[PDB]
């Protein structure tokens, strides 16, 4: 009847105005990626259209999505961060 | 304003999340630190809660899922999950509409029940507790 709360994928959505270096930085700062992988993941975002940055408890993911989105907002770019159920 | 005890229990669980260098302090961290809070547990004991099976289940889940900071940099401090922030606020806001000047542990406990996607709540609900229950106990005793 009851189930533990799902896990959430934290996604990064590509846009035409956000500078890739920013995306790379966001990936490095908020997801602990080294440049090698960070750049790749960015390439996914950029060419795939979106990319799964990590997977956490809903309780957490909601928060990462918020932080990433603010940083975006503060550094004046539309870089969209979202979450989805695993 | 929070009662001496609750604030202890907070500083307590916070201090623990830095010592283990946890990125975020969650509700689970809280509900847990609550387990050893006068006001909180009384209510829990009163609902016949396995104060030991909970502690485990939480400690355990706090572990498997709480991102840890990279031993590298110290230019970061335990960030309260949004859910934490909300629980804490739903409790201050209610103690405020009752006039009494101090928020109690149990006040927070009741709050947690409202963060429906937290584990802390699923746990509490798995141990057969319900908001009513906790609230009934705080209003009267039964």
UniProtKB/Swiss-Prot annotation, chain A:
GO biological process, one term: proteolysis
Top-rank taxon, per record: Bacteria
Entry's Gene Ontology molecular function annotations: molecular function inhibitor activity; protein-folding chaperone binding
Similarity comment text for this entry: Belongs to the ClpS family.
Role according to the record: Involved in the modulation of the specificity of the ClpAP-mediated ATP-dependent protein degradation.
Subunit structure comment from the entry: Binds to the N-terminal domain of the chaperone ClpA.
Name of the protein: ATP-dependent Clp protease adapter protein ClpS
Source species of the chain: Escherichia coli (strain K12)
Lineage, uppermost ranks: Bacteria, Pseudomonadati, Pseudomonadota, Gammaproteobacteria, Enterobacterales
GN (gene name): clpS
Curated annotation (Swiss-Prot), chain B:
Region (Repeat 2): 80-142
Region (Repeat 1): 2-65
Transmembrane parts of this sequence: none
Residues of the Clp R domain: 1-142
Function per UniProt: ATP-dependent specificity component of the ClpAP protease. It directs the protease to specific substrates. It has unfoldase activity. The primary function of the ClpA-ClpP complex appears to be the degradation of unfolded or abnormal proteins.
Protein family according to the UniProt entry: Belongs to the ClpA/ClpB family.
SUBUNIT field: Component of the ClpAP complex composed of six ClpA subunits assembled into a hexameric ring in the presence of ATP, and fourteen ClpP subunits arranged in two heptameric rings. Binds to ClpS.
Descriptive protein name: ATP-dependent Clp protease ATP-binding subunit ClpA
Taxonomic source organism: Escherichia coli (strain K12)
Gene designation: clpA
């Amino acid at each position: 009847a009851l189930k533990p709360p799902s896990m959430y994928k934290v996604i990064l959505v590509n846009d035409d105005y956000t500078p890739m270096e920013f995306v790379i930085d966001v990936l490095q700062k908020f997801f602990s990626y080294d440049v090698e992988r960070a750049t790749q993941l960015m390439l996914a975002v950029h060419y795939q259209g979106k990319a799964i940055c990590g997977v956490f408890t809903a309780e957490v993911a909601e928060t990462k999505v918020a932080m990433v989105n603010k940083y975006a907002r503060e550094n004046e770019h539309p870089l969209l961060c979202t979450l989805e159920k695993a | 304003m929070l009662n001496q005890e609750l604030e202890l229990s907070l500083n307590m669980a916070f201090a623990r999340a830095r010592e283990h260098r946890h990125e975020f302090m969650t509700v689970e961290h809280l509900l847990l630190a609550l387990l050893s809070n006068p006001s909180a547990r009384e209510a829990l004991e009163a609902c016949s809660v396995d104060l030991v099976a909970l502690r485990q289940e939480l400690e355990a889940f706090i572990e498997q899922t709480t991102p840890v900071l990279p031993a590298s940099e110290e230019e970061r401090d335990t960030q309260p999950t949004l859910s934490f922030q909300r629980v804490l606020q739903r409790a201050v806001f209610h103690v405020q509409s009752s006039g009494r000047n101090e928020v109690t542990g149990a006040n927070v406990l009741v709050a947690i029940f409202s963060e429906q996607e937290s584990q802390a709540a699923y746990l509490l609900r798995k141990h057969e507790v319900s908001r009513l229950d906790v609230v009934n106990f705080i209003s009267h005793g039964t």
